[PDB]
Write a protein that binds this ligand. Structure first.
Ligand SMILES: O=P(O)(O)CNC[C@@H](O)[C@@H](O)[C@H](O)[C@H](O)COP(=O)(O)O
Ligand SMILES: O=P(O)(O)CNC[C@@H](O)[C@@H](O)[C@H](O)[C@H](O)COP(=O)(O)O
Ligand SMILES: O=P(O)(O)CNC[C@@H](O)[C@@H](O)[C@H](O)[C@H](O)COP(=O)(O)O
Ligand SMILES: O=P(O)(O)CNC[C@@H](O)[C@@H](O)[C@H](O)[C@H](O)COP(=O)(O)O
Lengths: 257, 254, 257, 254
């Protein structure tokens, strides 16, 4: 099955930033033809820790910018919603509607996403056990979703720290396609360690998943969000090549569900 | 005055609310040194299963809660799940409650603060005590004046919550602190631990306790394993006041 | 039942230090006649993080110093053992033999302590669940122990942090008398916060336990071990008075096992 | 060379050790790029229950292990529990193993280091990765030259262990790192997770893997639910080498 690579800048800082990243993602999609690329960027960071942190330029601006990316590069699009009313307008451009980790149990949000007919990707809450994602998928199927993904992004481990329990990959695979979030899984909540992004992503593909999620920015140090975890854009190609190589050699050993 | 927030988990029917409201009204008359607030959710918007009880809708719920306030003169509190619900709920709710999973949703907090009502935020199971400072800052920025933070346990491995009582004195630095005695006891919960931990909370020091109570928990449509039998509420409240009276002498300053 | 207060300097820095603390504990035992005091101090810190940290002056010196405390003040004694061979000589002076938290599963150490005929107090390992202490007590009874205590001292919560799950008190009470370690439960492993010692001890007595364990030193800042958690000796009396008051008012509500 | 430490959890009988030793000897001949070390405990000194299998004693165990080394020419490793056992065990053990619960017992570490043998310390379930630096310092101070640190999971709530793979690159700063594939999967363990996590370990990068294996795990007197069937060992080793060959290109420097 075609491996999925979901990547893009954390927040839609500007349509210009999006087009710059989209250009590189498009180039990579032409090289790695065995990969299905999906361009990601949030029109709103609705859960920042501080009221003073950057959120975005609004849903309208964001959807317009994402539509530009899709129009100019022919790339699939994904973005997250925060309240039910956003599902409809976002579905006009998003191929995959993303459900934030803190909101993975909000029934109406999941239902709003599911009735759009678009694929839905739920980030597993830091509080949720792997086996409890079964009910999340059930809610989506109930709501009409036919293409469902579950994303591993770490679990609360003491205060201001997340651990990745890789046993979650084969467990969640029982009911949905599984994505590994390589950048948020190493973040330190309300404190991330970029030095662990690559080794953990190698672990994810060796264990076996259906795709990886990576936030990338031309200059992470200047990012308006997740400046400590976003991967420099120039490093994306090398990481993807490594992903595919490890996936290939490990693939014959992936257990059947 | 010490705050006691209590009532059935979900608004199973205004009838149920009236029966519980009657008992809470009685206790309110018996314990004048306590500020009672009637609580019940018009919607369980985050159930694990799609086939579980959610409720009868916001309108029916606000109506039922309105009936309790008018018939008993009790303050009211219920939780909201999306920003648009703040305004209509604020018509009856003296305290707007923010769900634990939603304690970081900026718009929900601002929407509640904008109503002019008091706001009680359930501390997320993923949040560290010191990180609630930013939560309070959002509400203040939103115009909130009366702010509460509720301790309801922290993720401890899978399907288990632990109460780190160090959080009480830490959160008290920036807001009044309430201890949720019913949801905090989640085991892979267990009613036998409710009273013991409530005693711990008041010995440590808090500004109030939150307790879900139902006439027949066994028949509750939500949190049946943790809702306190109505008949046991008076005894626990009296125990709370006695321990607090003695322990309060040792509560650390700010 | 007579409440137990186990207190003393963490390590036997000197026989002089022991006599100074013992003098104060003796004075308090004369005031709080409803309390059973047990003087504690380790002849060896056999598990320090660093090879360069203070350990002690040897078993011989330690037992001799403890015997002096008992002889001069008529106080019961408790100290911990680290290897089986130490049980016999330590039992010559110790009324209660303490089993370190990391060693709560070492069968031979528990058995060595149990056959001495002395009471045995096992510190619950930071890795052990409350319900799994049942087998620890079973091992001791099997080995001949007739007076057994289990001490709550925190549980691993992420890295370098311990949390106290107070549900452990009523759970462990099912099979042994329960002691709350007020000073080690707030320590930050390999990093304690002294500001939380008092509030958590208030919690322990409100929930209900059979005693409390508190390391105390005339000048904690100069202690050779646990300098960040040992309680100043001058504060001991006030803390004990508070303990008894809260215990009394909460006592009628203690659940039956 | 990549290290593979394997054998039955407990020395149920020298017969069992010979049967496993024969297979490990064969694999040793098949995979020349791998350094094999036969492992088995002469005593399970930390069983939860007093009524569980411990073993046949140190003398019988050292004798049985001696037989494996002499009949197959394989290196040996076993764990010690008290300081006095180091000397007699060092007569046969090329690597002295320190139990996880005992990784902070200074005298045990020094006793092992004093034998002149290599020392492998199982990282306590309570220890943070960075805190193993002090463990290595004790062994060096004790004269140890060849030192290993083994990842075997970390306490995650109750009756559950999680493997934080960030520990591999962190511990590598001060010692060779081994991944314990069998004990690391403790669930409220589960054999279905052994292979998946072993693959993760080699993709991340380690210096060896530790695997308990038994001809008939179902009949094992210890770790029956987690011991790898002997017949599956070859396949896993080959998988390990293939993934390592490809992934090693990306292992971070020191
Ligand atoms: O829903 P999630 O899986 O967290 C994913 N997406 C949103 C993230 O970009 C965001 O929540 C991320 O975890 C951020 O690291 C938190 O933000 P802050 O720096 O204000 O403390
Ligand atoms: O925000 P909170 O503190 O959880 C409070 N409000 C909602 C709770 O009453 C309750 O529904 C909670 O989610 C409970 O964890 C039990 O629900 P479920 O049966 O779906 O597994
Ligand atoms: O067995 P325990 O419950 O830990 C109890 N008694 C021994 C303690 O004094 C000691 O282990 C204590 O936890 C110390 O805080 C650890 O020492 P270091 O500062 O070297 O990192
Ligand atoms: O120090 P360690 O890494 O645990 C290794 N040595 C011992 C293990 O083989 C094993 O006995 C371990 O304690 C296991 O956790 C299972 O044992 P039990 O059946 O008593 O609950």
């Amino acid at each position: 099955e075609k491996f999925l690579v979901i990547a893009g800048p954390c927040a839609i800082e500007s349509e210009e930033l999006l087009l710059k990243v989209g250009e590189e993602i498009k180039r990579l999609s032409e090289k790695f033809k065995e990969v299905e690329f999906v361009f990601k960027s949030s029109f709103d960071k609705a859960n920042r820790s501080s009221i003073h942190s950057f959120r975005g330029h609004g849903l309208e601006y964001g959807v317009k910018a994402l539509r530009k990316v899709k129009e100019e590069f022919g790339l699939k699009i994904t973005t997250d919603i925060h309240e039910s009313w956003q599902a409809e307008p976002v579905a006009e451009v998003a191929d995959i509607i993303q459900i934030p980790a803190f909101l993975c149990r909000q029934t109406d949000l999941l239902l709003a996403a599911a009735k759009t007919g678009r694929a839905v990707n739920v980030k597993k809450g830091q509080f949720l056990a792997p086996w409890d994602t079964k009910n999340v998928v059930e809610k989506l199927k109930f709501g009409g979703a036919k293409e469902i993904y579950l994303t591993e992004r770490g679990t609360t481990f003491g205060y201001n720290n997340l651990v990745v329990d890789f046993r979650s990959l084969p467990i969640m695979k029982q009911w949905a396609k599984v994505i590994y979030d390589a950048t948020h899984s190493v973040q330190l909540p309300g404190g991330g360690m970029r030095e662990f992004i690559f080794p953990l992503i190698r672990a994810a593909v060796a264990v076996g998943c259906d795709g990886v999620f990576m936030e990338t920015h031309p200059e992470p140090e200047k990012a308006l969000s997740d400046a400590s975890t976003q991967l420099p854009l120039s490093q994306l190609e090398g990481i993807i090549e490594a992903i595919l190589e490890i996936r290939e050699v490990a693939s014959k050993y992936y257990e059947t569900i």
